[PDB]
Amino acid sequence: QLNPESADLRALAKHLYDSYIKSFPLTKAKARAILTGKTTDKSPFVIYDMNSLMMGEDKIKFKHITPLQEQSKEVAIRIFQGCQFRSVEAVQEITEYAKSIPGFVNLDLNDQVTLLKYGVHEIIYTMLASLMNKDGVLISEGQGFMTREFLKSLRKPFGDFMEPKFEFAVKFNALELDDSDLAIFIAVIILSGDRPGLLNVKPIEDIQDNLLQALELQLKLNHPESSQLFAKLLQKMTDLRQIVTEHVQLLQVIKKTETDMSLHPLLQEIYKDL
């Protein structure tokens, strides 16, 4: 028996899911379909070693997930550049989703920037989980699949970047959330009134309160038998924070060890004084 209040919350949930589908080309629904089973070109090419990687570049439409060179001795840096490029693209998608969140574009512009600066990576890790399973991660719009073991065997620094994400993913995936759930959750993440440097926290907390309300209802309707999923999901927010912290440290190592590499401008600004 939908009430007048719960009615508006359902409308918000629908709106967000709609914008999510429109803003993110590769949904968890598609990722799962690729990862589990089918025959259509949905089957990804699997990269689990140097030779398969070499053939991957030939098979997979890596149209652009590689800078201007390839014979860069180590594949470690080629993967680095590719992952970097995808993140920038993800920031772009998340930024577009954000503008669809009711009230977000009406907030002070400096705060819009602050909210995006701190929320984008937490969102990136949340959604990256949709593309992972305990054995690897979908890449190049789902065309390829790079194994966890392969990524772990990379040169000293690089071989330590992905594991923490996989550990978070296997755990987060156990909540069995679908795209309709995630659309609201990522909205909640963005409208965080506790981000450093925010000018007007009040209007932001008001928007988040309504999102939380929407998320609460969504999880109870969509996952009836999942006791306290709402609270379990909210607690996952601490895991995302840690991933970021740790990630930043690994980045500082790369910056010093690899003088010939550099973070993309967008990413640099995001991490500056974080």
Ligand X SMILES: */C(=C(\CCC)[N+](=O)[O-])c1ccc(-c2cccc(C(=O)O)c2)o1
**Which one of residues 6, 8, 14, 26 is an interface residue with ligand IMN (CB under 6 A)?**
26
Count the residues in the chain.
274
Residue 269 amino acid letter: E
Determine which helix (DSSP H) or strand (DSSP E) holds 132, and give its type and residue range: strand 132-133
Closest C-alpha among 7, 36, 27, 31 to residue 183? 27
Q: What separation in angstroms does the CA of 37 have from each of 61, 199, 265? A: 21, 48, 39
84 appears as a binding residue in the annotation:
yes
86 appears as a binding residue in the annotation:
yes
Assess 86 for contact with ligand X (CB under 6 A).
yes
Assess 20 for contact with ligand IMN (CB under 6 A).
no
Residue 139 or 191 with smaller CB distance to ligand IMN: 139
Determine which helix (DSSP H) or strand (DSSP E) holds 45, and give its type and residue range: strand 45-47
**Which one of residues 216, 222, 258, 267 is an interface residue with a copy of itself (CB under 8 A)?**
216
- Residue matched to tokens 């979908």: 138
* Maximum Cα interatomic distance, the chain, rounded to a whole number of Å: 63
For the segment 137-176, give every residue that binds ligand X (CB under 6 A): 137, 139-140, 146
- Residue matched to tokens 């490029």: 85
Residue 9 or 47 with smaller CB distance to a copy of itself: 9
Specify whether the CB–CB gap between 180 and 13 falls below 8 A: yes
State the Cα–Cα distance between residues 36 and 133, nearest whole angstrom. Answer: 10
Cβ count within 10 A of residue 99: 11
Which stretch in 84-92, 198-206, 211-219, 236-244 sits in contact with ligand X by CB under 6 A?
84-92
For the segment 118-147, give every residue that binds ligand IMN (CB under 6 A): 124, 127-128, 131, 137-139
Contacts of 17 (CB under 8 A, 6+ apart): 179, 180, 183, 184
194 binds, options ligand IMN, ligand X, a copy of itself, none, Cβ within 5 to 8 A by partner type: a copy of itself
For the segment 157-196, give every residue that binds a copy of itself (CB under 8 A): 171, 194
Closest C-alpha among 207, 1, 258, 243 to residue 129? 243
Residue 128 or 233 with smaller CB distance to ligand X: 128
Taking the CA of residue 89 as centre, how many other CA atoms within 13 Å lie in the half-sphere pointing to its CB?
14
Residue 171 or 255 with smaller CB distance to a copy of itself: 171
Residue 231 or 274 with smaller CB distance to a copy of itself: 231
Interaction site with ligand IMN (CB under 6 A): 26, 76, 79-80, 82-84, 86-87, 90, 124, 127-128, 131, 137-139, 151, 154, 158, 161-162, 165, 254, 267
Interaction site with ligand X (CB under 6 A): 62, 65, 78-79, 82-83, 86-87, 90, 124, 128, 137, 139-140, 146
Interaction site with a copy of itself (CB under 8 A): 171, 194, 209, 212-213, 216, 227-228, 230-231, 234-235, 237-239, 241-242, 245
